[PDB]
């Protein structure tokens with residue numbers, strides 16, 4: 001499960017939160033082992049009595065999943081960046097086991113894009129789409145620097161918070177986002193993450209449409225293995241499509257580096273290009 005992160009050896013122990021300091025409110029979602037709740041957390045930060053957090057409750061007992069829980073918590077404790085979901089610690093007193101994250105009020109980025117298509121409501125402008133893209137790229141520059149391979153970068157795995165701050169997480173194969181070497185050989189690297197970033201850029205510029213939406217799962221696997229490229233979105237300026245194409249080079253060693261992709265997006269976000277579909 002976390003075997004691919006073995007080279008990452010944690011420095012310190014995970015933060016422990018007392019069960020009575022977590023007050024569950026309501027479910028935010030489920031899927032992967034298992035439910036996610038909005039909660040209030042007491043005594044976490046010294047200046048604030050209580051604050052909102054998202055709490056993931058582990059389903060299994062198990063005791064193989066308990067070892068996977070401790071390993072995951074030690075790895076998440078290492079991830080400290082403005083654009084990576086903030087992990088606050090665990091609650092291991094009794095059952096279920098809990099993981100606690102900073103709450104991101106606007107929820108997942110895929111749903112956010114779909115709801116703000118063609119917080120201030122309405123369609124997101126070019127400047128805003130570039131700001132979202134730049135933030136996800138910043139998080140990916142941080143992960144590459146740590147030699148952390150994400151393996152499932154997609155807008156459904158990003159969160160939106162107050163002031164449109166975007167952070168990367170992993171909420172639980174994502175074939176449509178994968179390059180040919182990941183589909184065929186299960187090779188997951190910094191370079192397959194940059195390819196998925198190019199697909200995330202395509203999702204952002206299509207307001208959250210599924211990649212290869214015109215194709216079945218089988219047809220999409222075949223089209224990616226054959227080397228067909230995703231079409232340029234209508235809302236995408238030429239400068240941004242060039243970034244996507246750089247991420248999608250068939251040869252992994254020819255793909256643009258995430259540092260350069262992020263620097264290009266920063267430049268465009270601080271501009272933006274004069275483009276109208």
Ligand SMILES: CC(C)n1cc(C(=O)c2cncc(NC(=O)Cc3ccc(Cl)cc3)c2)c2c(N)ncnc21
Pocket residue numbers: 028029030036054056076079084085101102103104105107108143150159168169170171
């Ligand atoms: C969309 C809804 C349901 N939602 C999920 C929230 C979570 O934060 C969350 C839920 N379950 C598991 C995790 N675990 C990770 O993200 C692990 C991880 C972190 C970083 C990297 Cl690089 C890789 C892997 C986190 C959340 C939230 N915080 N606020 C609002 N909605 C949330």
